[PDB]
Amino acid sequence: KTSFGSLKDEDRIFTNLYGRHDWRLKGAQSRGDWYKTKEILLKGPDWILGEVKTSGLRGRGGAGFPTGLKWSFMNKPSDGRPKYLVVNADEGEPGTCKDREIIRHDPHKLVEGCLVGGRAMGARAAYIYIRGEFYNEASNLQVAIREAYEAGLIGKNACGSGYDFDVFVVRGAGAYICGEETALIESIEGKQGKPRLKPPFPADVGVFGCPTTVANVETVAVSPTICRRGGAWFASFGRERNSGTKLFNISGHVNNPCTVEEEMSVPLKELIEKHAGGVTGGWDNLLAVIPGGSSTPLIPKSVCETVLMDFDALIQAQTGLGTAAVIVMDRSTDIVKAIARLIEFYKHESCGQCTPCREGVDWMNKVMARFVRGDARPAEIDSLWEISKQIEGHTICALGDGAAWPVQGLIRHFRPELEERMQRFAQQHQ
Amino acid sequence: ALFVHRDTPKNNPETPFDFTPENYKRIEAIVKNYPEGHKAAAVLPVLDLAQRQNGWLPISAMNKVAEILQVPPMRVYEVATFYTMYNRKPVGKYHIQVCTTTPCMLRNSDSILEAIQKKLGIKVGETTPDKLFTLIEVECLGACVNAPMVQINDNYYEDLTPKDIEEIIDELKAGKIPKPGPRSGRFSCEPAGGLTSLTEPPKGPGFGVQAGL
Amino acid sequence: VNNTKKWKMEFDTRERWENPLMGWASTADPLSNLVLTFSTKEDAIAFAEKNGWSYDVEERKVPKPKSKSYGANFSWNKRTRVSTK
Numbered sequence A: 001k002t003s004f005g006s007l008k009d010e011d012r013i014f015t016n017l018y019g020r021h022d023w024r025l026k027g028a029q030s031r032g033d034w035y036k037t038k039e040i041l042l043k044g045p046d047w048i049l050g051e052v053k054t055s056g057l058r059g060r061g062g063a064g065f066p067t068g069l070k071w072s073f074m075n076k077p078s079d080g081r082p083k084y085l086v087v088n089a090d091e092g093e094p095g096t097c098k099d100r101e102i103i104r105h106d107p108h109k110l111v112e113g114c115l116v117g118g119r120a121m122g123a124r125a126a127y128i129y130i131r132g133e134f135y136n137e138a139s140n141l142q143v144a145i146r147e148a149y150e151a152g153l154i155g156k157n158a159c160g161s162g163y164d165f166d167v168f169v170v171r172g173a174g175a176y177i178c179g180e181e182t183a184l185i186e187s188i189e190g191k192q193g194k195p196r197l198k199p200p201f202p203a204d205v206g207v208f209g210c211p212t213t214v215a216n217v218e219t220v221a222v223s224p225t226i227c228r229r230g231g232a233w234f235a236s237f238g239r240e241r242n243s244g245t246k247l248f249n250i251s252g253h254v255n256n257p258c259t260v261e262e263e264m265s266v267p268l269k270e271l272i273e274k275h276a277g278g279v280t281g282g283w284d285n286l287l288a289v290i291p292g293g294s295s296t297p298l299i300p301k302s303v304c305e306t307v308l309m310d311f312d313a314l315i316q317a318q319t320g321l322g323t324a325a326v327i328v329m330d331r332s333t334d335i336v337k338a339i340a341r342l343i344e345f346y347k348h349e350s351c352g353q354c355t356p357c358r359e360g361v362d363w364m365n366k367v368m369a370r371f372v373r374g375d376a377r378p379a380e381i382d383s384l385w386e387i388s389k390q391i392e393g394h395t396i397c398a399l400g401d402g403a404a405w406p407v408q409g410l411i412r413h414f415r416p417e418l419e420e421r422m423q424r425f426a427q428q429h430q
Numbered sequence B: 001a002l003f004v005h006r007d008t009p010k011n012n013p014e015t016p017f018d019f020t021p022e023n024y025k026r027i028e029a030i031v032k033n034y035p036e037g038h039k040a041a042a043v044l045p046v047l048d049l050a051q052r053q054n055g056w057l058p059i060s061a062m063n064k065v066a067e068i069l070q071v072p073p074m075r076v077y078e079v080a081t082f083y084t085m086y087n088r089k090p091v092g093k094y095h096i097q098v099c100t101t102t103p104c105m106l107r108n109s110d111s112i113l114e115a116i117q118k119k120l121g122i123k124v125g126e127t128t129p130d131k132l133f134t135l136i137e138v139e140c141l142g143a144c145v146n147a148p149m150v151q152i153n154d155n156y157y158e159d160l161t162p163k164d165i166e167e168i169i170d171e172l173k174a175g176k177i178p179k180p181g182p183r184s185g186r187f188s189c190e191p192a193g194g195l196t197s198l199t200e201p202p203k204g205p206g207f208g209v210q211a212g213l
Numbered sequence C: 001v002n003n004t005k006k007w008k009m010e011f012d013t014r015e016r017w018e019n020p021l022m023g024w025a026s027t028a029d030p031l032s033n034l035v036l037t038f039s040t041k042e043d044a045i046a047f048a049e050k051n052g053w054s055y056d057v058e059e060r061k062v063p064k065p066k067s068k069s070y071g072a073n074f075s076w077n078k079r080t081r082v083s084t085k
């Protein structure tokens, strides 16, 4: 198989993505959720982890770590402490609005994902850290969790398998940093959402000091569909080390900004023209694309022609996959203003813990605010490159990396627009 | 917009604040979601509950939460200054949160911000003189395919125009509550011009179940 | 800790009184500003005995090795959890 995309309605894991069906238990049971969950759980953690490592599922949060290898770090003997699955539902990324749809429209798929994943890792319960802005989604998920308890699907004697597994929803309070896994752990512990240092990875010391796996809502909710359909089926979508389906958020300057599910290596031009109704003005109106949410570097029109929307081809296209949240930008876009407002986001959402992010992200925002007006001289572009390279790799979590990357993408692909902005500032003010 | 407290006549540790008894039942239910010895983990939902009761946090809700959870007051002060929901000044009753990050800015949230400024008669950060509306400018609220959007105290009002947000503010000033969703023809997140996916009915339970399960 | 590498030899401090004209610190001790630097301890001991100076010896105090664990800041059941970070 060399051609990818054109994912059919039968191979969609997230059926009822659109809220067109009943999200409650009577609707979710009619779509495959909570079917043979007892026979999934009775087959031990080892078979579940074998099917997930078979399935090629990587991290749907955005980093793309191999999910089954990650979950096997909890497959270890007990030493007095309990174990927890924690479901990362914060979703603060600009461009990214898909886990909101998973919580709001397929909640029982998330609860069955919590049950199967916590069985895979021996976890006692599940803390689902939802965003505090998602209040309707949180009440929605608590309704579905009450439906799961009252049907006996979770809790005492979960689905009749003799396993005990609670599912909790902890609401956030408006911090983009509390989507990073250790800052999320600290936000569960009643503290400031400041990220911990790695190691300890949460499989050793996580929430409350217990062994812990923090995974995304997407890479938790697709796990019972993997454990039902088999590993190699889900592995037969997308390229190798790019196994499966993915929820894309084609936002920005398109005719139909939408959330859709598609095969993992679908082309970007085909995705925009086939699901979003194309760029506003056709393909000849495209200027740049932020391919996977705000923390990934933009890429211009000459790269977006042939590029594939997965991890490896976007790393070869000097960006990252990330959350697979496509932000489309046309020729009517002040692009330096857009990246400067994105750096303004990354300083208004940055917890101020370590030195390079706390000072350098504010300093990059001031330099970008002068770049928008053009109030600079062309040595400062290379200066800003060196500032971004000093932030990148010197932080505690990847918000410093995810803030240095839009600057590096903007400079790397649009240095001349910065230079002509500055020189027309210099002619009209002197 | 400051991160220290100065004792006003209306904000001090002798400002009256206490929970209703149903809020004490809810606080016990919150604390029961956390392990024994980690009672300090419930600072965030109990302080959020204090905001839901009072509308905002004086420094008596912070001290009451610190008293009932037996944590220091400083550790609740860190939480209430760290997060952008714990309102430490009394906001208006409708708290209009306009998102202005890059996906909402690409679909002209600035026209909506100007429309709210000329419809209410205020600017960013201020409060209307009836104390019903407070307009601030927030970061990404996570509704990016439904950009541009706003949040009014709990509820996302999406796919807006200037006229849609004028209409929503008008039916807020009439004392009612609008419908929390998009204001274009679509319902949640589908393509606006029609369903490019999920057209077929689902297969039902048991589709594609491998042998041995 | 680079100033804790070498042995030093100072002397007992004598009277520093107020100059009547300007209020300066007048002294009558010529050995008041004399600090001698030595690599090891027996070098300083032999140099003090060689010059007939009565001496006392205070041993080099190394900071004892600690056990540091960043994971101890987030324990499950010990008191070494931190209430903030």
Ligand SMILES: NC(=O)C1=CN([C@@H]2O[C@H](COP(=O)(O)OP(=O)(O)OC[C@H]3O[C@@H](n4cnc5c(N)ncnc54)[C@H](O)[C@@H]3O)[C@@H](O)[C@H]2O)C=CC1
Pocket: A059, A060, A061, A062, A063, A064, A065, A070, A073, A090, A091, A092, A093, A096, A179, A180, A181, A201, A202, A214, A216, A295, A320, A321, A322, A323, A397, A398, A399, A402
């Ligand atoms: N989904 C969202 O809303 C957002 C996603 N992101 C994504 O997050 C990415 C950054 O991810 P991070 O969490 O900073 O780190 P990431 O590099 O380390 O690691 C991914 C996961 O694997 C685990 N892991 C990694 N190396 C490990 C090792 N040696 N041993 C054990 N476990 C290990 C980590 O605990 C983590 O859960 C960005 O590139 C971006 O794509 C960023 C912002 C928002």
Ligand SMILES: Cc1cc2nc3c(=O)[nH]c(=O)nc-3n(C[C@H](O)[C@H](O)[C@H](O)COP(=O)(O)O)c2cc1C
Pocket: A058, A059, A060, A061, A062, A063, A064, A065, A067, A070, A088, A089, A090, A091, A092, A093, A176, A177, A178, A179, A180, A181, A214, A215, A216, A217, A219, A397, A398, A399, A402
């Ligand atoms: C600053 C920052 C914010 C993050 N926010 C989220 C988030 O909101 N949701 C999410 O699922 N992952 C987020 N992540 C990625 C997590 O650290 C973690 O990789 C992920 O939640 C779980 O790993 P997974 O990709 O295997 O699911 C964030 C990372 C960083 C550095």
Ligand code: SF4
Pocket: A177, A194, A195, A350, A351, A352, A353, A354, A355, A356, A357, A358, A395, A396, A397, A398, A399, A400
């Ligand atoms: S780099 Fe920024 S986001 Fe990360 S621990 Fe430091 S202040 Fe926090």
Ligand code: FES
Pocket: A093, A094, A095, A096, B099, B100, B101, B102, B103, B104, B105, B139, B140, B141, B142, B143, B144, B147, B149
């Ligand atoms: S950009 Fe406004 S909702 Fe994400």
